[PDB]
Structures are given as structure tokens and as C-alpha cells.
């Protein structure tokens, strides 16, 4: 697998739209047909690791991030690996990372976003 995580440009502090895009996740593979993806943080807010909280570097304030509603609906399956839920998607595909839930008022800051991606056959 080859993965890219690309930030969305033009993001502004203040009230953002519901499900405002913030990053794109690209996953490609010449061998594997599918991939699982989970968010990585100290505060994962749902059972599949597809919604989680990220803290700002300079302010320490939290935003809610996760896979978009539309991205979630493209899932092939949910698997269980060592007990942990992993939603799977077709390789050679892009997914949207968004601000989750209702409109968020976002403080101006840098916010690190980390994901685990795994190949599946």
C-alpha cells in the first residue's frame, strides 16, 4: 500500500460548516484489494475508530474529526482484528476527513491528524 494524507487548503477559524472537509486520504495498492482505516488519538469517540478528537498544538483546544458520512457509506465491511473493529474500503480510492457532527467553532491553530491504514485481502 501507498498512502497520502493531504490537508485541505483555505481553512478558516470560527464557525465552520457541518462536515467541512479538512483532509483527503488516498490509498493505492498493486496487490491488495482492500484496506482498513482507524484514527489515532488519545480520545477515540466511536467503536470503529472513524470519529476521534484532536488537540491544537498552541492552544490545546479540541476539535472533532472523522470520516465523512459519504465516505462511511462506501465501506465494504467491518472486520475484527484481535477484537478491534476496522471498517474496510476498496483500495485505489479516496476518503474525506471532516469536522464531525454539528457546526464547530474552531480556534485558529495547527491540528495534527493521524490514522492507521492496513491492507486486507
Amino acid at each position: 500500500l501507498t498512502v497520502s494524507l493531504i490537508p485541505v487548503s483555505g481553512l478558516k477559524a470560527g464557525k465552520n460548516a457541518p462536515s467541512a472537509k479538512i483532509a483527503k486520504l488516498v490509498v493505492n495498492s498493486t496487490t491488495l484489494k482492500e484496506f482498513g482505516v482507524r484514527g489515532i488519538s488519545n480520545n477515540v469517540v466511536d467503536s470503529t475508530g472513524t470519529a476521534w478528537r484532536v488537540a491544537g498544538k498552541n492552544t490545546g483546544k479540541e476539535i472533532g474529526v472523522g470520516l465523512s458520512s459519504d465516505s462511511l457509506r462506501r465501506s465494504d465491511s467491518t472486520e475484527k482484528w484481535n477484537g478491534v473493529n476496522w471498517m474496510t474500503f476498496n483500495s485505489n480510492d479516496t476518503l474525506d476527513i471532516v469536522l464531525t457532527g454539528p457546526a464547530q467553532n474552531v480556534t485558529a491553530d495547527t491540528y495534527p491528524i493521524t490514522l492507521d491504514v492496513v491492507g486486507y485481502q
Partner: peptide
Amino acid sequence: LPNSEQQKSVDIVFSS
């Protein structure tokens, strides 16, 4: 396929 696993990270910037 655990040997194809990877952690990927980026900074997202909200400007004033």
C-alpha cells in the same frame, strides 16, 4: 495483512 500496516500524519491549519 499486518506487515502492510502504516501510521500516517499531517498538520491541519485553521487561519484567522
